[PDB]
Amino acid sequence: LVHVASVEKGRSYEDFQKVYNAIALKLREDDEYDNYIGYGPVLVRLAWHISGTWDKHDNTGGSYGGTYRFKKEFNDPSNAGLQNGFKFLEPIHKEFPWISSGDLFSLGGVTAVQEMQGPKIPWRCGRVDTPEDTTPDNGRLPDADKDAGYVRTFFQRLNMNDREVVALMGAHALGKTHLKNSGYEGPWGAANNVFTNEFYLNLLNEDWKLEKNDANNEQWDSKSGYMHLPTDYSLIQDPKYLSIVKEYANDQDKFFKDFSKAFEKLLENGITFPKDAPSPFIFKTLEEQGL
Numbered sequence: 662l663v664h665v666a667s668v669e670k671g672r673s674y675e676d677f678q679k680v681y682n683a684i685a686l687k688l689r690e691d692d693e694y695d696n697y698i699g700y701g702p703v704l705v706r707l708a709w710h711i712s713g714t715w716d717k718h719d720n721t722g723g724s725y726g727g728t729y730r731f732k733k734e735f736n737d738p739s740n741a742g743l744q745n746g747f748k749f750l751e752p753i754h755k756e757f758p759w760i761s762s763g764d765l766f767s768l769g770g771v772t773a774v775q776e777m778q779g780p781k782i783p784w785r786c787g788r789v790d791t792p793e794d795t796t797p798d799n800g801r802l803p804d805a806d807k808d809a810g811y812v813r814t815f816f817q818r819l820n821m822n823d824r825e826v827v828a829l830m831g832a833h834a835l836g837k838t839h840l841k842n843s844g845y846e847g848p849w850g851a852a853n854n855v856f857t858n859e860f861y862l863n864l865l866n867e868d869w870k871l872e873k874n875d876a877n878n879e880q881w882d883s884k885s886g887y888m889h890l891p892t893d894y895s896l897i898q899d900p901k902y903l904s905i906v907k908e909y910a911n912d913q914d915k916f917f918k919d920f921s922k923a924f925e926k927l928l929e930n931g932i933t934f935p936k937d938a939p940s941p942f943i944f945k946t947l948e949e950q951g952l
């Protein structure tokens with residue numbers, strides 16, 4: 662498969678800045694979701710899940726085709742709880758009917774990170790909705806109950822290296838696990854809707870205990886009331902992952918720079934951009950526009 666980026670007809674930077682503004686204004690407004698965490702966290706998880714289906718070997722899956730819109734992908738067990746991010750974005754799609762689903766679902770993740778005080782993420786437009794029979798089969802997204810060798814091998818299918826995996830996993834300072842969605846329960850840290858390097862600091866500084874939860878799964882619980890998954894804990898059990906965790910724990914700007922590069926790569930995998938295509942857009946925040 663080749664998937665060529667095609668700009669929605671007649672749209673410029675200012676049109677996309679309006680879809681960003683509408684998502685950011687509705688984040689501000691619906692601040693009560695999930696005990697006042699807000700929709701920022703589930704929106705960056707939706708953007709990583711519609712992107713994480715990509716297979717570098719045959720170019721199937723990934724964000725291009727917007728296939729989460731179809732029943733097979735939408736009802737994937739690994740996607741449980743993302744229906745709330747969908748429902749949030751749906752009024753926005755009725756208001757800007759011209760934007761493709763992949764461009765909307767992926768820009769939601771970009772808007773969420775930047776409005777949570779994260780780094781600026783360059784974003785490119787051009788994904789095109791593809792038909793229901795291009796929807797990927799369930800089972801391409803990663804299990805939580807596994808080790809650093811599984812993690813390295815999984816992210817090789819999206820050709821992410823070590824540094825990109827550790828930077829990307831830093832998004833697990835956001836939001837929380839919910840028993841009914843994934844069989845895991847608890848927050849990651851204290852500031853769960855502001856983007857910081859907290860994930861790395863907690864993994865290196867907390868006294869973690871392995872315990873079973875009410876779903877019979879194991880997780881790593883700390884005295885402070887925070888939790889982490891076996892796959893997160895992996896990043897300090899592996900010596901190559903561990904020196905990068907340390908690096909981000911000591912330098913949040915280096916972490917913001919590397920997360921920005923790796924998250925844009927994740928969102929752009931499987932997509933070919935012609936060089937007549939516009940440069941990646943850097944969107945201004947509500948606060949930068951005085952709105």
Ligand code: HEM
Nearest residue numbers: 702703706709803804805829832835836837838839842843
């Ligand atoms: C091996 C990798 C990963 C695994 C196994 C994994 C697994 C999970 C699980 C089990 C949850 C909790 C879902 C729930 O109950 O609601 C979760 C939440 C989350 N994950 Fe990951 N994750 C991985 C990678 C990533 C990456 C690369 C990103 C983003 C760049 C990400 C972003 C998030 C976010 C923001 C949440 C919080 C969602 C919320 O608060 O509702 N994850 N992840």
